[PDB]
Structures are given as C-alpha cells and as structure tokens.
Design a protein around this nucleic acid. Sequence first.
RNA 1: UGAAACUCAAAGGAAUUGACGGGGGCCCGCACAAGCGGUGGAGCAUGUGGUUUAAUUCGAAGCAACGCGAAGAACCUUACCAGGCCUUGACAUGCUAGGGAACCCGGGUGAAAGCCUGGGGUGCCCCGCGAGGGGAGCCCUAGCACAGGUGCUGCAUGGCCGUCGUCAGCUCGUGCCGUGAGGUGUUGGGUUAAGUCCCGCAACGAGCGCAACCCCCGCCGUUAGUUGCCAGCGGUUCGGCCGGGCACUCUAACGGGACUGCCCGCGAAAGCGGGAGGAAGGAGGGGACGACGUCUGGUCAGCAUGGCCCUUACGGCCUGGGCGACACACGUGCUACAAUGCCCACUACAAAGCGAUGCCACCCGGCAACGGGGAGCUAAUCGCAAAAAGGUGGGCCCAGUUCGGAUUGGGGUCUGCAACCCGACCCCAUGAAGCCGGAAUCGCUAGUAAUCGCGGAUCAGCCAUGCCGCGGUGAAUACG
Lengths: 206, 80, 24, 60
Amino acid sequence: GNKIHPIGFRLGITRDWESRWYAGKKQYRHLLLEDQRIRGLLEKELYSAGLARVDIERAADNVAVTVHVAKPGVVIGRGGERIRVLREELAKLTGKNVALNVQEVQNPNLSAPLVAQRVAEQIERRFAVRRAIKQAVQRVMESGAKGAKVIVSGRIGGAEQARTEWAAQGRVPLHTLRANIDYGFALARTTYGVLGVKAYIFLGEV
Amino acid sequence: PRSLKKGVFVDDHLLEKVLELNAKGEKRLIKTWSRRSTIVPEMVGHTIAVYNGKQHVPVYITENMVGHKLGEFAPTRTYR
Amino acid sequence: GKGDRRTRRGKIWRGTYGKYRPRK
Amino acid sequence: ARKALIEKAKRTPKFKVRAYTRCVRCGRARSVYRFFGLCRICLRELAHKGQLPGVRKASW
RNA sequence: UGAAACUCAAAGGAAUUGACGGGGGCCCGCACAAGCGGUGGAGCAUGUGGUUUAAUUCGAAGCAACGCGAAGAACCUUACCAGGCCUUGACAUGCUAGGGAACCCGGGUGAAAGCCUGGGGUGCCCCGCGAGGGGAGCCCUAGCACAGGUGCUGCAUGGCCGUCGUCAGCUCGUGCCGUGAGGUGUUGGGUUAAGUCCCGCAACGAGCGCAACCCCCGCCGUUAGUUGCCAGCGGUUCGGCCGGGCACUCUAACGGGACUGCCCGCGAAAGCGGGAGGAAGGAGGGGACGACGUCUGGUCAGCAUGGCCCUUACGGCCUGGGCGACACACGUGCUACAAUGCCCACUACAAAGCGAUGCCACCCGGCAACGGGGAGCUAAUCGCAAAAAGGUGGGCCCAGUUCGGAUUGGGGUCUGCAACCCGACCCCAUGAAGCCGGAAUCGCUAGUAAUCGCGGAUCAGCCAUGCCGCGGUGAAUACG
Ligand SMILES: [K+]
Ligand SMILES: [K+]
Ligand SMILES: [K+]
Ligand SMILES: [K+]
Ligand SMILES: [K+]
Ligand SMILES: [Mg+2]
Ligand SMILES: [Mg+2]
Ligand SMILES: [Mg+2]
Ligand SMILES: [Mg+2]
Ligand SMILES: [Mg+2]
Ligand SMILES: [Mg+2]
Ligand SMILES: [Mg+2]
Ligand SMILES: [Mg+2]
Ligand SMILES: [Mg+2]
Ligand SMILES: [Mg+2]
Ligand SMILES: [Mg+2]
Ligand SMILES: [Mg+2]
Ligand SMILES: [Mg+2]
Ligand SMILES: [Mg+2]
Ligand SMILES: [Mg+2]
Ligand SMILES: [Mg+2]
Ligand SMILES: [Mg+2]
Ligand SMILES: [Mg+2]
Ligand SMILES: [Mg+2]
Ligand SMILES: [Mg+2]
Ligand SMILES: [Mg+2]
Ligand SMILES: [Mg+2]
Ligand SMILES: [Mg+2]
Ligand SMILES: [Mg+2]
Ligand SMILES: [Mg+2]
Ligand SMILES: [Mg+2]
Ligand SMILES: [Mg+2]
Ligand SMILES: [Mg+2]
Ligand SMILES: [Mg+2]
Ligand SMILES: [Mg+2]
Ligand SMILES: [Mg+2]
Ligand SMILES: [Mg+2]
Ligand SMILES: [Mg+2]
Ligand SMILES: [Mg+2]
Ligand SMILES: [Mg+2]
Ligand SMILES: [Mg+2]
Ligand SMILES: [Mg+2]
Ligand SMILES: [Mg+2]
Ligand SMILES: [Mg+2]
Ligand SMILES: [Mg+2]
Ligand SMILES: [Mg+2]
Ligand SMILES: [Mg+2]
Ligand SMILES: [Mg+2]
Ligand SMILES: [Mg+2]
Ligand SMILES: [Mg+2]
Ligand SMILES: [Mg+2]
Ligand SMILES: [Mg+2]
Ligand SMILES: [Mg+2]
Ligand SMILES: [Mg+2]
Ligand SMILES: [Mg+2]
Ligand SMILES: [Mg+2]
Ligand SMILES: [Mg+2]
Ligand SMILES: [Mg+2]
Ligand SMILES: [Mg+2]
Ligand SMILES: [Zn+2]
C-alpha cells in the first residue's frame, strides 16, 4: 500500500492535464461530467484503434477533443465517414456541437497505455504471462526508452493463488520529479478473474 | 421547553376524519399511521390506534392530553 | 466556564449570540 | 451503489428535503464533494489521472 | 556376550541463507531517562464491547479496530424490522403476439405506494372518391430471451489503503571463489541523517532505495499599481476621505542568494571543531515523496471482478419504527474542580478561508434567538467580522461560592411536508457530580509543548466537544 500515481505526482512539471479549461463553481461539475461522458464513449468505441490518450480543451461552447491514436486509419474510416458518425454521436451527447482531431502516435510501443493494453490482450488470449511481460519490456526498450517496467497482477496462469510478475530494465526513477515517466494501466477480463497490468516507461530527464 | 411555531401542525389525514365522526357521532376507534400529528380539542373522547412501528395501540384521549403528539402515547421500543 | 450558556465565553464557545453576548 | 437507488435523480423527489446528492461516477452516497459532483475516491482517482483541470497536489 | 516379535520413512553427518538468544561488540528513534502538560476518578459528547429488542443493518479486532468506512442517520440516507402493495419490473437491449397507441385533465379508495374508474385528442407512411385497410417509432395487456441482489466468498481477485518504515536497506550484470545451497561486490578503517562520502580491497560497474530536481516559509532585486501611504505637498464633512504618487507595506510571476566558497586548528582523504562576513550556514525550518518484500493485513458495502446462491422473492415502491435501545465494561475527547481565577464595562494587534434561491452592512420591533425592511457585493474594492487570551477600570474574597453548568420544569425563535421516538438555538426558573483523580498509562526537544480564538469541507437544519486548516501568546528539560 504505497507508491502514488506517477502522473498525478508529476502533474505540475513534465506532465499536463488531459482536460484543460476554466470554469466557475456553478459550471465545473457539469463540464467535468461532460468530459467524462466523452472519454467514456470514446474509449468504448475507438479501442480497436488503440487510443493512448484523449485531450479536451474548451473556451466557449467549443471543445477540442484531440484524440491520440496509434492507427488513425481506423478512426478515419473509409473516406472519412467514421469521424463523421463520431462527431454526430458527439453532438448528440453534448449539444455543444464541437470539433474533433486525430493525432497519430509514432512508435506505439513508447506510450505506456498502449503497451499495457498489448500485454493485457496477450493475457486475455492465454499467452505465457512471464514471457509476455519480458517481451513487452524488450520491445519498449529497443526503441528509445531510457527505462521500462511492466507489472502483472494475481492469478497468473489461472493459478488459484494470486502472484505478481516483475520484469523491468533500464532506469525507472519514480522518486525523481523531472523523470517524465509515462504510466499506463490495462485490465484483463479472463474466465477465472481479473488481471491488472501496469506499464512504466522512462524517456529523457530534464 | 419544547416549541413548534405559529400555525400548529396536524396531518390532514385524520383531521377531516375526526370531525367527520363528530358530525354524525363517535363510532369506534380509528387507524392512524401519522404519529407526527398534534392533538386538538375535537379529538377528545375518541380513540385512536397509533402505529408503534409494529402494531396499532388503542390510545384513549382525554382533556389533559391536548397538545402532545400521538406518538408520545405509543412507545416504539420494548424494554425489560 | 465555556460550558455556561448564560456567559459571554459560553456564547463564544458555542458560537452563538444573545442577551449575554450582544451583536452591539 | 445499488441500481435502484440511482433513482436518486428525480425531477419529482416529492419533497425538496428527500433530495440527496450522489457520486455521478461510482454512485457513492457518502463523501460527495458538491464542487466536483464526485465522491472522494473517484475524486482522488481522476485527480491522479489529471482529468480534473487545475487540480494539483498541495504541499506547504 | 546379545537377540526376536512388533513398528517408522526416516534416523543421521557437514556446510548455507535466515530468524532467534534471559550471547558479545558498535549505533540510532520522545525508546528510556530530564522536564512540561495530560488520560485513568467526575459530568457530558462520541465510538465500541455486552445485554435488550420486531429490528437495535453491515463492516473494522493488539501496535496497524474502537470522534474508524460516516467530510452531517428525524423522512431521505438505509442496506434492518412491522405492515399495505408491485411484478418484463425503478434501470439496459431484443423477440412473438391481440388490441390501443404521441398525450392532457379528472373521480373513487388509501397512511402513502398502489389498485380501480371516467372524460378530452386521433397528427405521421402508403393505397383508396369515400368508408376504410395495412405500417415505423412510442406508449398499455399477455408470453419469451433478460434486468436486478448492499446475498456469500477479500485465502478465487483487480484497484486502492494500513503496516514494519523515511527504517538504510534490497538486488542485478560480468568477473573471481565453492562439487553444491551459496559467497565475493554490500565485508574492513574513517565519516554521515543515510549502502552519504572517503580510504582500502578479486573485484569492476549498475538498478530500485538515500540525496537532488517539485511546493511553502525565511533576506534582497526586476517587472505592476482599483491594495498601500502628510513616506510628500494641496484640499479635508480630518475617515487614505478628495486631488495625487509607486517610495514603502502588500499582492503574484520571474530571478538572485549558501557552495565547507573564505580564515585558524586536526586529518591520508571524506569530513569534524571553531571564527569571519551574511537574513540564513554545515540537511536554514516545514511539506510532498515511502525500496525488494512482510503481515493468506483491510476492503467483493465506493467501483470493478471469477465462482456460488435468490429470482411473485435474498428483486422493487411506500407509511411507520430502528441504526438514538441501557444492569453494565472500555477507547477517544469536551467542560471543569477556581484568585497565575470567574464576572461586567471600555479599548487594541492576525492569518487563512467562504459567499446569488448566497454572505447579509445599516434602520425598526423584540431582553434574545430571531422577524420585517433593505444598501453593497459576479467580490485585494461589499459581507461573514466579534478575533480571544491581552491592556485599563470596577465587582467577587476562599465559600462548593458571582467556582462548575449536568439534570429538570416552563415559555419561545428557525430549518424543514413533518422536530414524540430523535434537531439546533434563545429566555426564565432549577444549580447535580466535581476540592486536581487507585493500580496503571499518553504526547511533545522550539516557535515545539501548553494555552487562546478564527475559517472550511459535508449540510435545509444538526446532535461538530469530531476532522482538516489558520494565526495570537509562548515555556521547561536532555547527565547520559
Ligand atoms: K564501514
Ligand atoms: K529541506
Ligand atoms: K492478502
Ligand atoms: K493535574
Ligand atoms: K481554560
Ligand atoms: Mg503463465
Ligand atoms: Mg408560533
Ligand atoms: Mg458560572
Ligand atoms: Mg453494485
Ligand atoms: Mg440530506
Ligand atoms: Mg450526500
Ligand atoms: Mg547440523
Ligand atoms: Mg524473561
Ligand atoms: Mg520519562
Ligand atoms: Mg472520566
Ligand atoms: Mg456495530
Ligand atoms: Mg459482508
Ligand atoms: Mg487507532
Ligand atoms: Mg483520530
Ligand atoms: Mg425505508
Ligand atoms: Mg442473473
Ligand atoms: Mg487480502
Ligand atoms: Mg487486496
Ligand atoms: Mg475480515
Ligand atoms: Mg483474512
Ligand atoms: Mg531519511
Ligand atoms: Mg513520518
Ligand atoms: Mg555475481
Ligand atoms: Mg565449503
Ligand atoms: Mg565453479
Ligand atoms: Mg550473487
Ligand atoms: Mg550478498
Ligand atoms: Mg560478508
Ligand atoms: Mg550509494
Ligand atoms: Mg556506514
Ligand atoms: Mg569496496
Ligand atoms: Mg521586495
Ligand atoms: Mg479590485
Ligand atoms: Mg491594486
Ligand atoms: Mg516599483
Ligand atoms: Mg526522496
Ligand atoms: Mg451508527
Ligand atoms: Mg440491559
Ligand atoms: Mg436481567
Ligand atoms: Mg472497547
Ligand atoms: Mg463592519
Ligand atoms: Mg435593538
Ligand atoms: Mg481598497
Ligand atoms: Mg483586570
Ligand atoms: Mg481587577
Ligand atoms: Mg452557582
Ligand atoms: Mg459534594
Ligand atoms: Mg475550593
Ligand atoms: Mg478510585
Ligand atoms: Mg505514577
Ligand atoms: Mg523529534
Ligand atoms: Mg454546516
Ligand atoms: Mg443530542
Ligand atoms: Mg467549529
Ligand atoms: Zn465515486
């Protein structure tokens, strides 16, 4: 029972909020609810595109919604009809009638959430967990990545007793503020239960 | 040292009921789930079964009982 | 002391006002 | 958070006093901050994800 | 000298890593000691055990459960109980099927929920002169696939948290030693808050930890004047009120500054002792931050989730009660037992915060709670607001009292559909125990303890004496 969330730890320096906007006390809770519904609809749709993040900005009755994805070809669709339907759902949920953008993620293996999602997928397909982890860490490390760590939680291999498998290399200095460590988390829903998957990636310092 | 306010509260469920009796008579008992209702002079002489949370208790009401709530005469807890 | 309803300090502690602790 | 209890949101609570807040996310009853509309747990989780604008860790 | 029946999956040797020792050495921490104030006694608040109950919902169990989940239990919350009801349901998606379909307003009954009943209105798509027929959504009845469960399992789990422990540690790569478990490194000497650094060394490096980069408080500067000031002059209803001005205070962004840098002494070095200059030295003060792992630690009752179980009820709606029971026992606290004090009057200095179905200046009524009226404020510009201890003046004169305000009678104000169970607040009367607390036991090393007030979160109101913050005054002691 320790180790605060590294993103939340770093939000001031070498990390920035996913939702950046100002609002009053009579406003905030509502816009927040909205953002939450947006992310909740987006993540249960665009999953197959591998979204690593969703940014949300506002000024007046307008919302950025910059979606970071590994495979923009999925969110575009054929000739751009997918993004049309998505903007349609967006306007149907929130009547604000706002915009949408798509940013490609170069080297999806350098973004933690995607790595975690990968390992999670492999676990859901009944891969060998230990090797899945070691492999993932290897792939992350081989491209940039001054450090990497991946953590899988209990019931590894469907075992009756929960366990924790480790597999990290490079440097992952969680206590350093200027670290700039991407963190990501993915579940695994299996027949025997649920597995947590954490992913730490350390790239650059100052 | 109790208080309520001006405009004393009585639930209108039985409020009209009791005077409906008084119009044509006395009759017998009553069944009331509202113990939050104050006692008013027109209720005197009647009999009100008050819910203690379990059963209805046959509370007979007298002149000196005016102003108290019905629930005061229907204790909810069973002790020793 | 701070437990006396009828004293200044009693009012201050209890955080209220009244006859024994005026609002001026 | 029982699902029937999410009947909390009512245009007709039948009384203003019967109206009580809940967590818009997890459905928690107790510990609901009015400002965020969330509960305290969700508050900390989302604050840690950085989904609450301006919300930072406080030290002094 | 020396058997047998019967019986066991071992008995045993040496060495390895640990843990332990009423074994040794070295060294830390309010651990003891030194000191200051407490708890244990009293009354009350609150949580728990137990008992009681129709129900007193569930959880938490030595530190690390017990003012804990609860940052607001009258209804709601609520998960418990009694009674009156509902079932393709309070919520999601879909299928078959008769009929009506969008929808609006009534009546009976009722504690409400619910059940029942009556009346308005027949837009869409297609075909037809029309009557009318068929049809999509939607809504009501009947059946089907399902919802739902705060029902059990935290040894089936995720996530998150507590804990040893902010403790000085835990490991890896390559090399070397050992048949091997393993060892070496990480041991030793010096030093440090630190596996911090130095020196040495079959080791050479490295990672997670330590430290640092982040925040607040300390001194100064730049940038900026709806806060500030006869610093400065003019006016003054003499109030920074008007003119006026960014010098000061402040406000909030950037930046400087401290590194054993300089001097003496010791030392092989790292560093130690002292001194100078400086607002500040040897980690300046306080936060955030808590390693490999341990406790089959806590939580399926915040959420998620495997398995199991109930599906005219283990689901669902409502009225009422209960979570507030009281012979008792414990924990945490509040107020006290007084003169270094209590009371009344006048008068002075703060920080951090909150404020639109909000804070509420000021006027009137009321002894008061409060009510009526009503200005300002999207708030460095108005309000909460009074800060209290403090100072000056006066009263009390050692007594269960002008100490202490429990208990109880009566009369009221406010919130709220509603204060019986079970709210807080005001006023009158009442005026309890308590004379510094047995064995035992707790916190704190400096602006700390002690003491005094102030704000906030949740919330209509409030059982807040709780929690989380803010400043005022400000100690004693540490041989060891
Ligand atoms: K040493
Ligand atoms: K420091
Ligand atoms: K466990
Ligand atoms: K004492
Ligand atoms: K005192
Ligand atoms: Mg496996
Ligand atoms: Mg009245
Ligand atoms: Mg007194
Ligand atoms: Mg649930
Ligand atoms: Mg409420
Ligand atoms: Mg609530
Ligand atoms: Mg042996
Ligand atoms: Mg002994
Ligand atoms: Mg001692
Ligand atoms: Mg006591
Ligand atoms: Mg209990
Ligand atoms: Mg349980
Ligand atoms: Mg405790
Ligand atoms: Mg506590
Ligand atoms: Mg109920
Ligand atoms: Mg089922
Ligand atoms: Mg456990
Ligand atoms: Mg767990
Ligand atoms: Mg348990
Ligand atoms: Mg257990
Ligand atoms: Mg330390
Ligand atoms: Mg600590
Ligand atoms: Mg080796
Ligand atoms: Mg050997
Ligand atoms: Mg060998
Ligand atoms: Mg080794
Ligand atoms: Mg070793
Ligand atoms: Mg050794
Ligand atoms: Mg080191
Ligand atoms: Mg050492
Ligand atoms: Mg060495
Ligand atoms: Mg300055
Ligand atoms: Mg201004
Ligand atoms: Mg200004
Ligand atoms: Mg200037
Ligand atoms: Mg650190
Ligand atoms: Mg309780
Ligand atoms: Mg008893
Ligand atoms: Mg008995
Ligand atoms: Mg106890
Ligand atoms: Mg004023
Ligand atoms: Mg007056
Ligand atoms: Mg001003
Ligand atoms: Mg005096
Ligand atoms: Mg005097
Ligand atoms: Mg007296
Ligand atoms: Mg006596
Ligand atoms: Mg005396
Ligand atoms: Mg005794
Ligand atoms: Mg003693
Ligand atoms: Mg200390
Ligand atoms: Mg409040
Ligand atoms: Mg009470
Ligand atoms: Mg308070
Ligand atoms: Zn929540």
